[PDB]
Design a protein around this ligand. Structure first.
Ligand SMILES: [Cl-]
Lengths: 211, 211
């Protein structure tokens, strides 16, 4: 089986204000740098074979802390990069709600139908993350694989892994510097643990709505 | 919204050997008694409005620990009782595998189709837990509800909560004395946290396959 450890990046500078990041590339916040270290210490307690990361700074820096703790290389992986939020990129949630209320409604109620103007569709995210996971299943059988990514691709991954409709997107928790444990077994994928944050202690932050 | 906290009972005396319990009623193990206290200590840090429990000893004793010192009355609930495993009840997993190989295969491959000889069907479990959850959503809106139950009804609950096929049964982790946090929201149910066991420390036990 594959032991798949799905990690959301530690807090970026834009997370506390709820600014849509997309393919834009802010640094980790100081709190996020602390979260990344705490997460790395927790994951270092077990054997890790390979670490994949979205190439954006927030994810890559989180992955580097995990990798340094185990003497591994981080493999940058475009297929797990954040959704391209297009015109929403750089906007606050409240700004999007005011300017694009109908598009916001579609995102929150029917995410599987969304295609961000100037950006990417959720269907496109699902397709690329699922292709990545299929390749991981083949390549990394009997290994432990860390995947450092973002809420949108991760939620798409849960749908893919369970074989459920992409319309179920919002039904999975995904906090900064959390990890989930998935066993990719012969007959199915099992979510053994979802959105674990105990290692964060006082640096735990509950995720923003609509992110 | 309902804050639904789904708890698997602490370890019973039959859990370490992998003996199918069904409606049989063993005590908690010594380890299980400690687990129930550790879980109670974790949940006491927050506001709980009501605690429902399967009436079996392993679930009820776990629920009592959580309630002590919140001065809550545990409400016994038949709809969240363990599946009736019928003829498997009292057998070890390895004995079931040898004696009933095709029935065991159906349980692991196509759980949604199973009806235990002398017992209950998984469809029946799904139907009763779904009705319980529908009543909880109505009655306990804006409240925090603890539900102390067993792997089989809990996995059926996750399927009902997500609005996915009962064939997805095995895809959810469910360790002794774990908790999951589900928000029952206006438009959907969200699994915020699944199968959290950090509070258990050295008393953590991984769940047996096929249970
Ligand atoms: Cl984000």
């Amino acid at each position: 089986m594959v032991k798949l450890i799905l990690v959301r990046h530690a807090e970026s500078e834009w997370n506390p204000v709820g600014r849509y990041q997309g393919l834009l590339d802010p640094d980790l916040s100081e709190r996020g740098k602390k979260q990344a270290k705490l997460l790395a210490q927790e994951l270092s307690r077990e054997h890790l074979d390979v670490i994949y990361s979205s190439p954006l700074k927030r994810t890559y820096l989180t992955a580097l802390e995990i990798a340094e703790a185990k003497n591994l290389e981080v493999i940058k992986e475009d297929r797990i990069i954040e959704i391209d939020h297009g015109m929403w990129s750089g906007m606050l949630v409240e700004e999007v709600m005011e300017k694009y209320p109908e598009d916001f409604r579609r995102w929150v109620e029917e995410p599987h139908k969304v295609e961000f103007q100037g950006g990417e569709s959720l269907a496109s995210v699902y397709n690329r993350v699922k292709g990545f996971l299929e390749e991981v299943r083949k390549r990394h059988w009997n290994q432990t694989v860390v995947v450092v990514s973002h809420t949108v691709p991760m939620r798409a991954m849960y749908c893919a892994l369970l074989g459920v409709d992409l319309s179920k997107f919002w039904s999975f928790g995904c906090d900064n510097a959390s990890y989930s444990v998935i066993h990719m077994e012969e007959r199915r994928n099992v979510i053994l643990k979802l959105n674990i944050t105990c290692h964060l202690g006082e640096f735990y932050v509950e995720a923003h709505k609509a992110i």
